Design a protein around this ligand. Structure first.
Ligand code: VW1
Ligand code: ZN
Ligand code: ZN
Ligand code: ZN
Length: 585
């Protein structure tokens, strides 16, 4: 027994064909079975024909006959159909409202999550369907990982380099950092974990969590997990206050945080607030400074990734009493300078998926573009806070959507928080970029920030762009543009100072070729998010939707503190770069 996801109506039915088995009320369960292919229904029992060796599961072809369920062929003389009178038969038949359109719930329940429109719907439907969609999508995502063939160590060629043998009659996953494997040792009667791993084309290059002397027979699967059901909304109800509530501001603050004092007061004057921090504007500075502005306030600092939490820890370590901090870790190497797993500590740093059930004066949720509605609900379920602060940038990269192929996902659809920031705007905006030369700040200000992002630094005169299509080659799941790497090689010979530069591209295969030919450190745009480097060399590689994505392009060029070279494929983004154009040698 549970709650209809459409009505909330109390009910004893769950759709058995829906992978999450939502509870549906007699009405909603009917409207759902008669208007989709979903025909298996679960109660306290499953509406299936309890006749010996009959295969009838369709609820519309079954009858209660006694206290058992039968099809037409096997039913007793005295029976009533399970599925008639615009209603499906179960407990609480007299408390049931329904809905005018079940259309959104069917779409969410049936879609394969390959189309953008599926994520658009999942983020614009009612709040209870946002939770159903977020569970359905995440279960569809964790199941898809099982579709992928086992990789097995056939030969250990070197250290850091392997020969894999793949399971037959199943696809092989892409070999980039968005697909993290787990190794396993061949035992007496079972297997035991042996750290997590990633792979890249050679033979294959492997950069595993821990070191080992792994040998033939060791194999790898993308580790999936149980998706738990959601209960809490993606956002609590907003409340605006006329005074700061449940927070006591400091009388003496330092001029390091004095630029945020007005924003800190705003945080205390509503239930949740959104902070848009463009690249190098001071998001973590903001977050730690909030502690010093409300010194008595218990603050839980959270984010999706261990890296995002550890970077809050690194900033705390520099401003907060260490004795007053704790890093929560579940039973991967992260921050090890606080007492571990001290929930009652005044400053708690913890990933979403590891959060304890606790209360706080303020919850700070960082790198919000990377959050899903699933993460948003989990935070609200674990943390009851006087105030919630969501810090991020909807102009930066979202969580990868491994099933999406048809369509692009616009920032207003990344999650509920990003939707607010792109429709009503953010509560707070960090308007000064301290990282990047003015040429890069002017470019991204016009590209994605409605000309509101201002440069601290002057022009560097070291921001350059080349329009060169080159030649595009494709491997199993990535792109290469050798001529664009050639152009960079010629550029380095004439400009040898740029040999301390970081190589960035949209493709891991472009990066592997560049690493060998140039010897620069490489990062995918996606892996560079949150990092900064003095000099950046960027090859667009292709003009695809992936390489032309404005959020990706915005992250790519805002990695640079001093100088950047962009080898561009797309005439559009080339023309938008406020960089010195260079001829082709
Ligand atoms: C003025 C210019 O400075 C650079 C210094 C470092 C890099 C890199 N990478 C590029 C350029 C020079 N050294 O010619
Ligand atoms: Zn269903
Ligand atoms: Zn219902
Ligand atoms: Zn039967």
């Amino acid at each position: 027994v549970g709650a209809c996801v459409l009505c909330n109506s109390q009910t004893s039915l769950r759709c058995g064909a829906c992978i999450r088995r939502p509870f549906l009320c007699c009405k909603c369960c009917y409207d759902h079975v008669i208007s989709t292919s979903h025909k298996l229904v679960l109660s306290v029992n499953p509406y299936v024909c309890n006749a010996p060796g009959c295969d009838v599961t369709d609820v519309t072809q079954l009858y209660l006959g006694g206290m058992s369920y039968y099809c037409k062929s096997h039913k007793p003389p005295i029976s009533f159909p399970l599925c008639a009178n615009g209603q499906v038969f179960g407990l609480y038949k007299n408390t049931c409202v329904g809905s005018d359109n079940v259309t959104d719930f069917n779409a969410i329940a049936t879609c394969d999550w390959t189309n953008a429109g599926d994520y658009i719907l999942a983020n614009t439907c009612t709040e209870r369907l946002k939770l159903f969609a977020a569970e359905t999508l995440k279960a569809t995502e964790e199941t898809f990982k099982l579709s992928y063939g086992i990789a097995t160590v056939r030969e250990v060629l070197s250290d850091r380099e392997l020969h894999l043998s793949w399971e037959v009659g199943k696809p092989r996953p892409p070999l980039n950092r968005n697909y993290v494997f787990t190794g396993y040792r061949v035992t007496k009667n079972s297997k035991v974990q042996i750290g997590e791993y990633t792979f890249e084309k050679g033979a294959v290059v492997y950069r595993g969590t821990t070191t080992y002397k792994l040998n033939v027979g060791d194999y790898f699967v993308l580790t999936s997990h149980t998706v738990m059901p959601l209960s809490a909304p993606t956002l609590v109800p907003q409340e605006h206050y006329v005074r700061i509530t449940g927070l006591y501001p400091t009388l003496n603050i330092s001029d390091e945080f004095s630029s945020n004092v007005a924003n800190y007061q705003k945080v205390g004057m509503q239930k949740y607030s959104t902070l848009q921090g463009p690249p190098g504007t001071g998001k973590s500075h903001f977050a730690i400074g909030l502690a010093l502005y409300y010194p008595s306030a218990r603050i839980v600092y959270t984010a999706c990734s261990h890296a995002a939490v550890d970077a809050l820890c690194e900033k705390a370590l520099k401003y907060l009493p260490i004795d007053k901090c704790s890093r929560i870790i579940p039973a991967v190497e992260c921050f090890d300078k606080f007492k571990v797993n001290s929930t009652l500590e005044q400053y708690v740093f913890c990933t979403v998926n590891a959060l304890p059930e606790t209360t706080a004066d303020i919850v700070v949720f960082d790198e919000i573009s990377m959050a899903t509605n699933y993460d948003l609900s989990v935070v609200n379920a674990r943390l009851r806070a006087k105030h919630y602060v969501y810090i991020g940038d909807p102009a930066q990269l979202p969580a990868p959507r491994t099933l999406l192929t048809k369509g692009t996902l616009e920032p207003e659809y990344f999650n509920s928080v990003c939707r607010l920031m792109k429709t009503i705007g953010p509560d707070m905006f960090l308007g000064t970029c301290r990282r990047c030369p003015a040429e890069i700040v002017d470019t991204v200000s016009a590209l994605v920030y409605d000309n509101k992002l201002k440069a601290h630094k002057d022009k560097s005169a070291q921001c350059f762009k080349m329009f060169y299509k080159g030649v595009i080659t494709h491997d199993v799941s990535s792109a290469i543009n050798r001529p664009q790497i050639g152009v960079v090689r010629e550029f380095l010979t004439r400009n040898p100072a740029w040999r301390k530069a970081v190589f960035i591209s949209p493709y891991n295969s472009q990066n592997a070729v560049a690493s060998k030919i140039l010897g620069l450190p490489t990062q995918t745009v996606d892996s560079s998010q949150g990092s900064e480097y003095d000099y950046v060399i960027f090859t667009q590689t292709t003009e695809t939707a992936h390489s032309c994505n404005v959020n990706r392009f915005n992250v790519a060029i805002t990695r640079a503190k001093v100088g950047i070279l962009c080898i561009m494929s797309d005439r559009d983004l080339y023309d938008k770069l406020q960089f010195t154009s260079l001829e082709i040698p």
